[PDB]
Design a protein around this ligand. Structure first.
Ligand SMILES: O=C(NCCCCCNC(=O)c1cccc(O)c1O)c1cccc(O)c1O
Ligand SMILES: [Fe+3]
Length: 289
């Protein structure tokens, strides 16, 4: 399991260790650059909008449009290091997309890593939210919002059909990639308990390459689709790629259970937010109930 965030109260600050290192972070930091879009939604959920100084506006989701008048620090995969420096942040919050630039960011300001653990989603999710909340004295508000999400999980689980199997795919340009348990989208199988049509899909960041013959041979009952074209600004769309004669023969296609999941939540936020995760849970529940 990934190392959790642990914190010591230092009066005016906390001394914080995460899997990438140690930082001293001020209490109530007033100028936070946020590069994980999930955590951006947690800031909103805890009414901390004014504490945000900079966001990756290249990849700012439609659901986070209230942050459209914050200064941009570029995109999640194209960080603007000069902009970050100019906003004089007290804290920079990053996840796995920026771990390779940890040292460079940390020369600028204290840099907190909030990656999710694909093997331990909920544990890491709670530790991320509670760590952030602790910085602001908001553990009570945060714990209530977690409890609400856990209650939504239970409700969702109780409607799942034990005799149906799902496949999770990512579409990119014309190409299709598969994801299963313990992947970046694994909450479908690991948290909500929908069975996997293929339990031996090897975990990788951008999935494992497949084609529509694979999808037909598996014949899943549900296909959950994540359209990375939307995120990249490509012209292609998953609807077009999957509207072929082999996919049409699946049970999923037949029962109108090809479900196009919003990739701003699933691919960008990755459920690493109080708002995003609740919305995502409801989107699965409403697709399969
Ligand atoms: O290290 C990563 N990517 C390196 C670049 C991959 C190749 C270029 N991709 C893009 O242009 C792109 C743009 C926006 C969001 C993304 O996630 C993208 O992959 C990475 C890490 C975790 C999650 C991801 O998803 C990542 O990518
Ligand atoms: Fe990516």
């Amino acid at each position: 399991a990934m190392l959790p965030i642990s914190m010591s109260d230092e009066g005016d600050s906390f001394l914080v260790k995460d899997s990438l290192g140690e930082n001293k972070i001020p209490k109530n930091p007033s100028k936070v650059v946020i590069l994980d879009l999930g955590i951006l939604d947690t800031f909103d959920a805890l009414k901390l909008n004014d504490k945000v100084v900079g966001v990756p506006a290249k990849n700012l989701p439609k659901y986070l449009q209230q942050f459209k008048n914050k200064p941009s620090v570029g995109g999640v995969q194209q960080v603007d290091f000069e902009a970050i420096n100019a906003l004089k942040p007290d804290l920079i919050i990053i996840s796995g997309r920026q771990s390779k630039f940890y040292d460079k960011l940390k020369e600028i300001a204290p840099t907190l890593f909030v990656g999710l653990d694909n093997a331990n989603f909920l544990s890491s999710f709670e530790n991320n939210v509670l760590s952030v909340a602790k910085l602001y004295g908001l553990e009570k508000e945060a714990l209530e919002k977690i409890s609400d999400i856990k209650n939504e999980i239970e409700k969702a689980k109780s409607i799942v059909d034990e005799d149906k199997k799902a496949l999770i795919i990512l579409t990119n340009s014309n190409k299709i990639s598969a994801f299963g348990p313990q992947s970046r989208f694994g909450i479908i199988h690991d948290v909500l308990g929908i069975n996997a049509v293929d339990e031996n899909i090897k975990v990788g960041t951008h999935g494992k390459s497949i084609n529509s013959e694979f999808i037909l041979e598996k014949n899943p009952d549900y296909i959950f689709v994540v359209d990375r074209n939307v995120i990249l600004g490509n012209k292609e769309r998953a609807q077009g790629i999957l509207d072929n004669a082999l996919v049409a023969k699946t049970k999923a296609a037949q029962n109108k259970k090809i479900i196009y999941l919003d990739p701003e939540y699933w691919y960008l936020a990755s459920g690493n937010g109080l708002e995003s995760l609740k919305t995502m849970i409801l989107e699965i529940k409403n697709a399969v109930k």
